[PDB]
């Protein structure tokens, strides 16, 4: 009663968004290295027991719809849900190839009132993206 | 009877708010590759916060950005865990 109940038919879905190439208008560079990210991640999360799906170069509209539809699926026999975002980002926001969309809007699809089959179930978002431009210089 | 709608979320950001996050064209990004490495070794026996805390340590300690490196001379990064979880999370059993 201090741990989440993991006795379900399957652990759950793992959605990986692998944004590498971006429209020039956004001013954002090719994210070299992200494929090796994406590739360590699915092997990794597959090994835990997730049903892993990898999407590549998604538009903002694509990213929204995709997560929206996932929210709307039946997670009844799933223990949890995981989503991993690999893209450019600025504070509170993450890049599609098309432009930016807020993290809140992406995750809100899974709120308890909007995804009842993941109610009382852990919802995991891993975010590889910048959150601003400040640099950390270190110390000692 | 009821449950907050924002409850049971966990966010594992690669960096703290306002700050930059690093990616190596050859190898991948620091955060992910630290994340996976620890998950490969401990995903099955450690609680999620333990895992992510250990990830925080490795990104913080094991990584710097070198001196001959232009643009970004010996720079550092710390990830950022946001937990609204209501229980301990183990990926097994």
């Amino acid at each position: 009663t201090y741990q989440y109940n993991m006795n379900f038919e399957k652990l759950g879905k793992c959605i990986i968004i692998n944004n590498k190439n971006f429209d020039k208008v956004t001013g954002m560079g090719v994210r070299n290295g992200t494929d090796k990210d994406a590739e360590a991640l699915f092997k990794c999360f597959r090994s835990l027991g997730f049903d892993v799906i990898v999407y590549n170069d998604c538009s903002c509209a694509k990213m929204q719809d995709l997560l929206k539809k996932a929210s709307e699926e039946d997670h009844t026999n799933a223990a949890c849900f995981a989503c991993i975002l690999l893209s450019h980002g600025e504070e509170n926001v993450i890049y599609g190839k098309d432009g930016v969309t807020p993290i809140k809007d992406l995750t809100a699809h899974f709120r308890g009132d909007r995804c009842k089959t993941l109610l009382e179930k852990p919802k995991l978002f891993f975010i590889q993206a910048c959150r601003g431009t400040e640099l950390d210089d270190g110390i000692q | 009877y009821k449950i907050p709608v924002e409850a049971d979320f966990l966010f594992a950001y690669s960096t703290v708010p306002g700050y930059v996050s690093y990616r190596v064209p050859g190898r991948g990004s620091w955060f992910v590759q630290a994340l996976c490495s620890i998950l490969e070794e401990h995903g099955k026996d450690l609680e999620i916060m333990q895992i992510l805390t250990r990830v925080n340590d490795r990104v913080a300690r094991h990584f710097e950005s070198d001196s001959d490196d232009p643009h970004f001379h010996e720079k550092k990064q710390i990830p950022c865990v946001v937990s609204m979880l209501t229980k301990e999370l183990y990926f097994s059993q």
Binding site: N32, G89 | V20, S21, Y22, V24, P25, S29, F72
Partner: peptide
């Protein structure tokens, strides 16, 4: 290194 590059930045996201």
């Amino acid at each position: 290194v590059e930045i996201x």
